[PDB]
Design an enzyme around this catalytic site. Structure first.
Site, PDB file in Angstrom:
ATOM      1  N   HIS A   1      54.248  26.274  84.700  1.00  9.43           N
ATOM      2  CA  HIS A   1      53.383  27.252  85.353  1.00  9.43           C
ATOM      3  C   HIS A   1      52.390  26.655  86.351  1.00  9.43           C
ATOM      4  O   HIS A   1      51.752  27.387  87.099  1.00  9.43           O
ATOM      5  CB  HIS A   1      52.634  28.107  84.314  1.00  9.43           C
ATOM      6  CG  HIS A   1      51.370  27.493  83.793  1.00  9.43           C
ATOM      7  ND1 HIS A   1      51.328  26.730  82.645  1.00  9.43           N
ATOM      8  CD2 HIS A   1      50.095  27.559  84.244  1.00  9.43           C
ATOM      9  CE1 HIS A   1      50.083  26.359  82.410  1.00  9.43           C
ATOM     10  NE2 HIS A   1      49.314  26.848  83.366  1.00  9.43           N
TER      11      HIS A   1
ATOM     12  N   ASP B   1      57.430  26.349  79.015  1.00  8.75           N
ATOM     13  CA  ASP B   1      56.416  25.908  79.973  1.00  8.75           C
ATOM     14  C   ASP B   1      56.417  24.385  80.043  1.00  8.75           C
ATOM     15  O   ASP B   1      55.557  23.717  79.473  1.00  8.75           O
ATOM     16  CB  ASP B   1      55.030  26.422  79.561  1.00  8.75           C
ATOM     17  CG  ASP B   1      53.984  26.242  80.662  1.00  8.75           C
ATOM     18  OD1 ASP B   1      54.370  25.987  81.823  1.00  8.75           O
ATOM     19  OD2 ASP B   1      52.776  26.367  80.372  1.00  8.75           O
TER      20      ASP B   1
ATOM     21  N   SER C   1      45.616  22.522  82.188  1.00  9.48           N
ATOM     22  CA  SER C   1      47.040  22.815  82.087  1.00  9.48           C
ATOM     23  C   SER C   1      47.971  21.695  82.561  1.00  9.48           C
ATOM     24  O   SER C   1      47.738  21.072  83.580  1.00  9.48           O
ATOM     25  CB  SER C   1      47.363  24.107  82.849  1.00  9.48           C
ATOM     26  OG  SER C   1      46.951  25.252  82.118  1.00  9.48           O
ATOM     27  N   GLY C   2      49.033  21.463  81.795  1.00 16.25           N
ATOM     28  CA  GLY C   2      50.003  20.442  82.132  1.00 16.25           C
ATOM     29  C   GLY C   2      49.607  19.078  81.615  1.00 16.25           C
ATOM     30  O   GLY C   2      50.410  18.150  81.624  1.00 16.25           O
TER      31      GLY C   2
HETATM   32  O1  LIG Z   1      44.998  31.153  81.882  1.00 18.59           O
HETATM   33  C1  LIG Z   1      45.018  31.607  80.739  1.00 18.59           C
HETATM   34  N1  LIG Z   1      43.969  31.463  79.891  1.00 18.59           N
HETATM   35  C2  LIG Z   1      42.679  31.028  80.446  1.00 18.59           C
HETATM   36  C3  LIG Z   1      42.403  29.532  80.584  1.00 18.59           C
HETATM   37  N2  LIG Z   1      42.509  28.779  79.320  1.00 18.59           N
HETATM   38  C4  LIG Z   1      43.599  27.982  79.338  1.00 18.59           C
HETATM   39  O2  LIG Z   1      44.338  27.972  80.337  1.00 18.59           O
HETATM   40  C5  LIG Z   1      43.951  27.143  78.255  1.00 18.59           C
HETATM   41  C6  LIG Z   1      45.027  26.352  78.600  1.00 18.59           C
HETATM   42  C7  LIG Z   1      45.467  25.583  77.586  1.00 18.59           C
HETATM   43  C8  LIG Z   1      44.771  25.720  76.440  1.00 18.59           C
HETATM   44 CL1  LIG Z   1      45.496  24.710  75.172  1.00 18.59          CL
HETATM   45  S1  LIG Z   1      43.468  26.878  76.611  1.00 18.59           S
HETATM   46  C9  LIG Z   1      46.187  32.334  80.213  1.00 18.59           C
HETATM   47  C10 LIG Z   1      47.490  31.982  80.779  1.00 18.59           C
HETATM   48  C11 LIG Z   1      48.684  32.632  80.258  1.00 18.59           C
HETATM   49  C12 LIG Z   1      48.575  33.627  79.175  1.00 18.59           C
HETATM   50  N3  LIG Z   1      49.761  34.267  78.775  1.00 18.59           N
HETATM   51  C13 LIG Z   1      50.457  33.780  77.660  1.00 18.59           C
HETATM   52  C14 LIG Z   1      51.759  34.332  77.414  1.00 18.59           C
HETATM   53  C15 LIG Z   1      52.368  35.320  78.262  1.00 18.59           C
HETATM   54  C16 LIG Z   1      51.650  35.850  79.388  1.00 18.59           C
HETATM   55  C17 LIG Z   1      50.278  35.320  79.642  1.00 18.59           C
HETATM   56  O3  LIG Z   1      49.610  35.784  80.568  1.00 18.59           O
HETATM   57  C18 LIG Z   1      47.251  34.002  78.630  1.00 18.59           C
HETATM   58  C19 LIG Z   1      46.053  33.351  79.160  1.00 18.59           C
END
Ligand SMILES: O=C(NCCNC(=O)c1ccc(Cl)s1)c1ccc(-n2ccccc2=O)cc1
Lengths: 52, 234
Positions: free
Chosen positions: B42, B88, B185-186
């Site tokens: 992603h 992912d 992320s990643g």
């Molecule tokens: O950006 C999101 N969260 C906010 C930021 N916090 C983080 O990035 C964190 C990253 C890693 C940890 Cl460890 S904590 C997010 C992204 C995707 C999803 N999501 C899941 C399944 C399917 C559809 C979908 O949108 C939910 C929320």
């Protein structure tokens, strides 16, 4: 217990082959003569913090 | 990273940072070898063109151990979908090999069976990144690391309003204000065994950051070890 017992005394990977412990190491390491310890082949082996 | 401590000199050498055209970090990655970086699928959608920087701990100013690497081949898992965030994962092949040194070294790839029975059975793992220190704050100029407990798979499925697939696992805290966050992320999730750190996860997602009753969600590297090897031999 074998691998269940303190990872079979292995430094890294532990396998149970024919009711016997068999140690192995990640890429970049060589299984020591005792067939348990893992020895790095270079200055920057994987998984080691660079604490010089 | 919310909470946790700074990565002191030489403590998180496998950390990689993906930087966009503006040379700003938007995601992390894990150094797998001189030519390969492990990251989240992603993340590739978070920037048109990007490079990989390694050996950095303070984005505020270059010191001399950093190195930018251009990506040659981007390999994303063909089964990833923004809808579920399943699969992912992605691997990057660099055009030039990384030169290992202080703060620049790869994390070990474990074997599937041993990792699942011995590494993911450990109490905790380590997650790191230049992500936000708070949910709605700014990205950290300092590389941070956080020890995160492995979370009961059942307990996490219960707390998640999103399906937790077999390719994901959960780590973190129920109430404590410590978690990975936006910008992380990643990045790497590694587990320590006898002073050797093995890659066990990829920072994937989480409902907000460090929220009570919510855990961090990571891609289960052990479910893609074959895929990873295959992506590295070509
Ligand atoms: O950006 C999101 N969260 C906010 C930021 N916090 C983080 O990035 C964190 C990253 C890693 C940890 Cl460890 S904590 C997010 C992204 C995707 C999803 N999501 C899941 C399944 C399917 C559809 C979908 O949108 C939910 C929320």
């Amino acid at each position: 217990k074998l691998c269940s017992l303190d990872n079979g005394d292995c430094d890294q990977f532990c396998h149970e082959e024919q009711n016997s412990v068999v140690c192995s190491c990640a890429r970049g390491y060589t299984l020591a003569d005792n067939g348990k310890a893992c020895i790095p082949t270079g200055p920057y082996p994987c998984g080691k913090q660079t604490l010089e | 990273i919310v909470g946790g401590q700074e990565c002191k000199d030489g403590e998180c050498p496998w950390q990689a940072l993906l930087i966009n055209e503006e040379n700003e970090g938007f995601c992390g990655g894990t150094i797998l070898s001189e030519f390969y970086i492990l990251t989240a699928a992603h993340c590739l959608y978070q920037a048109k063109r990007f490079k990989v920087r390694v050996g950095d701990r303070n984005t505020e100013q270059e010191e001399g151990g950093e190195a930018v690497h251009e990506v040659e081949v981007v390999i994303k898992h063909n089964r990833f979908t923004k809808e579920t965030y399943d699969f992912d994962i992605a691997v990057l092949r660099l055009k030039t090999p990384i030169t290992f040194r202080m703060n620049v070294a790869p994390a070990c790839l474990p074997e599937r069976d041993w990792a699942e029975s011995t590494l993911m059975t450990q109490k905790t793992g380590i997650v790191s990144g230049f992500g936000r220190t708070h949910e709605k704050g700014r990205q950290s100029t300092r590389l941070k690391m956080l020890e995160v407990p492995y979370v009961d798979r059942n307990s996490c499925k219960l707390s998640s309003s999103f399906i937790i697939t077999q390719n994901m696992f959960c780590a973190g805290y129920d109430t404590k204000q410590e978690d990975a966050c936006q910008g992380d992320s990643g990045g790497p999730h590694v587990t320590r065994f006898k002073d050797t750190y093995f890659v066990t996860g990829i920072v994937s997602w989480g409902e907000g950051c460090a929220r009570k009753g919510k855990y961090g969600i990571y891609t289960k590297v052990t479910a893609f070890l074959k895929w990873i090897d295959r992506s590295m031999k070509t």
